[model samples]
Target: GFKQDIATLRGDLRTYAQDIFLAFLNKYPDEKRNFKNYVGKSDQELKSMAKFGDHTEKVFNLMMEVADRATDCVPLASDASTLVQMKQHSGLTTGNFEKLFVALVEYMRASGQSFDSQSWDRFGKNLVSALSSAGMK
Candidate 1:
């Protein structure tokens, strides 16, 4: 019964989050502008637009941050005792966190010369702030 109640509350929270997210997108007028990344390119293309100037670098950095976080966070909290062992092993040897960081850095360096570092930092900071500012309703 307790788990069921928690599950219900979690579902309600997720719904609330989705509603506010949609509303937030509507709140910005500029955001509604050309949101798609069609870029006059083929639909089958695997790449997204690396907009010129600051936007490119900004995207690169934020991409790095996201890729980094996803790779790092996946293995966390799986099992308490295993976590202890993993942490010790990670500290001494190979680990996903280290692997993730290197992969992103290498990929970004090789991917393009136009990526903007400043924009990346700005995007990263803003994303964190927006997520932290979450509110119901």
Candidate 2:
């Protein structure tokens, strides 16, 4: 169920990655500072930047991979480590990770994406466990 739902979401990642990324920034304006290349750009300007599109696609790819591996402990642990290291390198807090997921869920729901609440909850719980195991809050 969760796997199927995640698959459905993954199918739409390429189509909505930019929209989702912008929604996240809209929800957490302060987080925009983390993207140095996008700092002084308007939303439209950001949309025109290949760097922004590449970064958003990369982020969504990581998220989908993590969700896809959530049921496998070994892979999940590896994905969790990657997430932890990325955040550490970017000076982001665990809370930032948590917020990003929340924003993703919110955007998906608002955009009428096909996903069940129960499945999303299951994936979210697995993610939280993975993050916690990787020494995140």
Candidate 3:
């Protein structure tokens, strides 16, 4: 009974999100093209799902999604030497970049995880940590 109710709720929520996302998608044909665009242009946000009680917070999550996709696009239409050169240019701080990437990728599963107040707190901390390490302050 509980599982069925939860499943029904999830279905209902998914249908609602689908309708909303489709509406936005119709407006922004380029949305799925790259997550970065949506992340960078808040004014262009499909539909701000961010509820910060009194502020907003979806920016980071959306950006992270886009950045993650960009990284996926790497090594495509790119050579080892060029990639190496580019990597050096960006100067990522990972001691072992590839290995660290593999380790950090463990969080990719977080996409399927539900986020609540506690999760938002952790997300905020992680975001600050990432920005600090990247000299983004």
Best prediction by lDDT: 2
Alpha-carbon shift of residue 108 in model 3 (angstroms): 22
Alpha-carbon RMSD of each model: 18.6, 2.9, 14.4
TM-score of 1: 0.22
Q: Give the poorly placed runs of model 1, Cα more than 4 Å off.
A: 1-110, 135-137
The order by descending lDDT is: 2, 3, 1
How does model 2 score by TM-score? 0.80
**Model 1 agreement with the true structure over 27-60: per-residue lDDT tens digits:** 4323323334433343223123334223434433
**How does candidate 3 score on lDDT?**
0.34
RMSD of 3: 14.4
**Candidate 2 lDDT, tens digit per residue, 28-94?**
8888777767777777888899888888888778777777776632236788777766743456555
- Give each model's clash number: 5, 0, 0
Q: Can you write out model 3's per-residue Cα lDDT over 1-137, one digit (the tens) per residue?
A: 22232233345443323333443434544543433434443443434444311121232233233233332122222222233344322543222232223222333223353423233233334433444454432
lDDT by candidate, in order shown: 0.32, 0.70, 0.34
Q: Model 3 residue 4 lDDT?
A: 35
Candidate 2's clash total is 0
